[PDB]
């Protein structure tokens, strides 16, 4: 199956409570493996998976350097964006950035993402060609022109194509026991309206459907690396389709 | 790993 690495960065401006808070998270598939919080005492990249702790201290040094550079960039970014929008200094504003890569079952490059959002709305998105930008509002034109003058699209494309894919392959090889694992969803029915439950499966991708002669909740993390989901219909078979299932399961009361 | 160059924003 296709495996993806992503990095999510959130910077929130605090009006007078101190410097803006910065949080960075790194995900492989649906499993987090790093974490940086600006208010944490360590102020270093922290491992959140058993396998990633195998990396030597030079890896953590490099990660901390990069993440602190990102923190400084976002701290500047909040101010420059407020200036671009001519917003008042009183309000708090949020800045989000997500970037990463995907690999297919053949473990070659398949897709790359880079996205920047201001106040929960799309601001600047790297296109699928990975050589151009997509800008929505007027300040986004200025940001795109500055970025094109900086030639950052080529650098980001090179990173996503080579380094993200190579290190995703390395992480998956290191975490073969956990990352390359499919768990069959334990499925059962409860009658009261019938609720069809799929519990303790991985990854989060599942499809539950209800058919008569042929509500839903977003998949929630169980907290132990597996997920749960259920679909209820008020009154008929529940069909569960998962990557880890050789054939989809059907349940009737 | 995080990107080195290109993190510059806005």
């Amino acid at each position: 199956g296709s495996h993806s690495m992503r990095y999510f960065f959130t910077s929130v401006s605090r009006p007078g409570r101190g410097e803006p808070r910065f949080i960075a998270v790194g995900y492989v598939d649906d499993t987090q493996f790093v974490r940086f919080d600006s208010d944490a005492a360590s102020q270093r990249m922290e491992p959140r998976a058993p396998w990633i702790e195998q990396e030597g201290p030079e890896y953590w040094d490099g990660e901390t350097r990069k993440v602190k550079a990102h923190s400084q960039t976002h701290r500047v970014d909040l101010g420059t964006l407020r200036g671009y929008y001519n917003q008042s200094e009183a309000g708090s504003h949020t800045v989000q950035r997500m970037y990463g890569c995907d690999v297919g079952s053949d473990w070659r490059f398949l897709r790359g993402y880079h996205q920047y959002a201001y106040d929960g709305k799309d601001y600047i998105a790297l296109k699928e060609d990975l050589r151009s930008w997509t800008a929505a509002d007027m300040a986004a034109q200025t940001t795109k022109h500055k970025w094109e003058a900086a030639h950052v699209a080529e650098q980001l494309r090179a990173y996503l194509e080579g380094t993200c894919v190579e290190w995703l392959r390395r992480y998956l090889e290191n975490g073969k026991e956990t990352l390359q694992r499919t768990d069959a969803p334990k499925t059962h029915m409860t009658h009261h309206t019938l609720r069809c439950w799929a519990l303790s499966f991985y990854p989060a991708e599942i499809t539950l459907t209800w058919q008569r002669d042929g509500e839903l909740v977003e998949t929630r993390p169980a907290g132990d690396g597996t997920f749960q989901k259920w679909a209820a219909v008020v009154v008929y078979t529940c069909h569960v389709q998962h990557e880890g299932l050789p054939k989809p399961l059907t349940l009737r009361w | 790993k995080l990107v080195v160059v290109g993190a510059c924003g806005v």
Partner: antibody, heavy 118, light 107 residues
Framework: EVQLLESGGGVVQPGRSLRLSCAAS????????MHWVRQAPGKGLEWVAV????????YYADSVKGRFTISRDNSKNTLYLQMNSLRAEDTAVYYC???????????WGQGTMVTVFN | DIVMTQSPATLSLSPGERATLSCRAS???????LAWYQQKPGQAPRLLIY???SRATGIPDRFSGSGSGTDFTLTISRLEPEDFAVYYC????????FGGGTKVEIK
């Protein structure tokens, strides 16, 4: 035994290029990024250049930007610095350093003198 | 750019006296990236403190480091005749930046 050895220093006239080579023995050279750091005679230490473990990321100081090129070759376990358009400001003792980390391992080369005059 | 300013420029202390050196960063720094070096007049610099608080291998107990954020300090509890040298502060969070250097000499 960890060891860094630098060669290529000497007297050079202004406007001419010089090459410095630092060979590392006793530790895994291919995993770590390396720095070139110069010290003027009687002056404090100044950082010149840095290179990553791939050699993909290289950075130079503001004073030496545009004239210095850092390189590494992990096959021969060597770290090179090519200095172009040398001026009277470029005279100093140069060191190749495996440092600037958090686990406390640093190795300093002997340091070779680069003097610029006529 | 990160700028590190060291104070005092020179120290004049008799042997056996306390020595305190200060290094101030232009911006907030991760405490794990500061180091303190000692350079003798005729040798290469030698790492004393790494991580702003941890001593290196084979460093006497008198050397200690403290501080966080922008301001850091290095303390020599009891000066020794061999402790008279030039002390630099270094940051490695972004590139590298050595301080001016505080030279301690006998009065």
């Amino acid at each position: 035994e960890v060891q860094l050895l630098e060669s290529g220093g000497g007297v050079v006239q202004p406007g001419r290029s010089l090459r410095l080579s630092c060979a590392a023995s006793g530790f895994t050279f291919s995993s770590y990024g390396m720095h070139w750091v110069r010290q003027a005679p009687g002056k404090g230490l100044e950082w010149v250049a840095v290179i990553s473990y791939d050699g993909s990321n290289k950075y130079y100081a503001d004073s030496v930007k545009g004239r210095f090129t850092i390189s590494r070759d992990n096959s021969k376990n060597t770290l090179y610095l090519q200095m172009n358009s040398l001026r009277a400001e470029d005279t100093a003792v140069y060191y190749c350093l495996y440092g600037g980390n958090s686990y406390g391992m640093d190795v300093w080369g002997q340091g070779t003198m680069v003097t610029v005059f006529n | 750019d990160i700028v590190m300013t060291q104070s005092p420029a020179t120290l004049s202390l008799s042997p056996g006296e306390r020595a305190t050196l200060s290094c101030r960063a232009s911006q907030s720094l991760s405490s794990s990236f500061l180091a303190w070096y000692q350079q003798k007049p005729g040798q290469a610099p030698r790492l004393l403190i790494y991580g702003a608080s941890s001593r290196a291998t084979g460093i006497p107990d008198r050397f200690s480091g403290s501080g966080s954020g922008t301001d850091f300090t290095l303390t020599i509890s009891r000066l020794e005749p061999e402790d008279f040298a030039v002390y630099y502060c270094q940051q490695s969070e972004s590139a590298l930046t050595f301080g001016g250097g505080t030279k301690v000499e006998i009065k």
